[model samples]
Target: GSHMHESKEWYHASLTRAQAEHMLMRVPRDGAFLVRKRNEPNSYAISFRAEGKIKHCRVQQEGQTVMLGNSEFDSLVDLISYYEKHPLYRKMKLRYPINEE
Candidate 1:
């Protein structure tokens, strides 16, 4: 193992540094993606938002790119840590409006 949200497992390792770097090109610096953590199961995301709504987005290594809803802001990051540290879900948890609605 490398570190939290670091490199992938040997068996799970598919793309090389060059390949992973190349994959970065596929990302549109102006959109969000429903990408799941390479090591964890589905449930989290790095949603991109802009102009009062989301424009485009993407998933993981083999994930697809698509449009998003009309809210939030487009974001950017190199790893899952980016979202974990930036998204409101992580910053404000139990206090979130999920129970106040």
Candidate 2:
């Protein structure tokens, strides 16, 4: 069971790596973020900004659950929600979401 953030504005399923990086860079916020589909099936990437630097991390799927950074969630939504309030890397939380549209 692969969970997706298809309906979420922050989930840019069709975004390319460069596009995602540009989108996050334009915001220039400490925690501007987006989720994009990876090249492999059932794979995903989390693109975000931390301290004015763009960063990308892969979401690791384990069994039926997906792990982002060092945390695990039941679905993509839950993962993003958790990181919105919780820090995933270097004490940086997924604060500002860069919507798809």
Candidate 3:
């Protein structure tokens, strides 16, 4: 129905164009990694080293401004594609890391 379309679009638009532009190649061994926010379910954050400094990108729509390095992947599948392509980043098997009853 129409509501399904709206739900999809609303989530899609939450990630901005500029945010999608900043893409990283790989995660560093010493410092870079991606993880889902412990406090905010469905939200994620990427931390990496840039120019000899640590940089962070928080993925969420509600904030004062869009965080740097934050990307707007078309969907979870798209995000998985990107993650799988990168060797270091692929270690993050975020979903179903463990099974439960």
Candidate 4:
């Protein structure tokens, strides 16, 4: 086991924007998504299909804690989990979780 469940399977560090679309390209919805390792520190980008198009947004780890709606998350997982069940940033919804190859 190289990476643990902290792997979050959903977070694919190697997945690219073009490749990410391959997973949800035809699915066409506002819920399907994949996560990728960002090029910057505390940068973990969340790629999702929104309004029939793919939108990539990164959640900057502000001092290892991120804030959402005046709420602060201890880690990226907490922020993502909240968004997955509730509202994704920018008024979008990550209603469905899709796995990448």
Question: Quick one: best TM-score, which candidate?
Answer: 2
Best-performing candidate as measured by lDDT: 2
Tens-digit per-residue lDDT, 1-101, candidate 1:
12233332211123333333333345434322233333333212333333323322333332321122332222222343334345433232111111001
Predict model 3's lDDT versus the native.
0.34
Point out where model 1 deviates above 4 Å.
Answer: 1-12, 30-82, 87-101
Q: After superposition, how far is residue 84 of candidate 4 from its true place, in Å?
A: 1.7
Each model's C-alpha lDDT? 0.29, 0.83, 0.34, 0.70
- Writing each residue's lDDT as its tens digit, candidate 4 over 1-101 gives 11232568677767677777788786767778877766776566778888788888766667757654466777767777778777775677676677763
Tens digit of per-residue lDDT, candidate 3, span 1-101 = 01222232112324323332232223323333333332454444444444433444555523432232465455433443354454323243222110110
lDDT of 2 at 81: 89
Q: TM-score each candidate.
A: 0.23, 0.87, 0.32, 0.75
lDDT measured at residue 7 in model 3 versus the true structure, 0 to 100:
32
Sort by TM-score, best first.
2, 4, 3, 1
- Of candidate 2, the 10-residue stretch with the lowest lDDT total is 1-10
Candidate 1: TM-score? 0.23
How large is the C-alpha RMSD of every model relative to the true structure? 15.1, 1.9, 12.0, 3.7
- Candidate 2, residues 1-92: lDDT per residue as tens digits? 45457778888778889999888877867888899988877778999899889889998656788886667778888888888888877889
Candidate 1 residue-wise lDDT at 90: 22
Residue 95 error for model 3, in Å? Answer: 20
Clash pairs, candidate 4, are none
Looking at candidate 3, what is the lDDT of residue 52?
A: 34
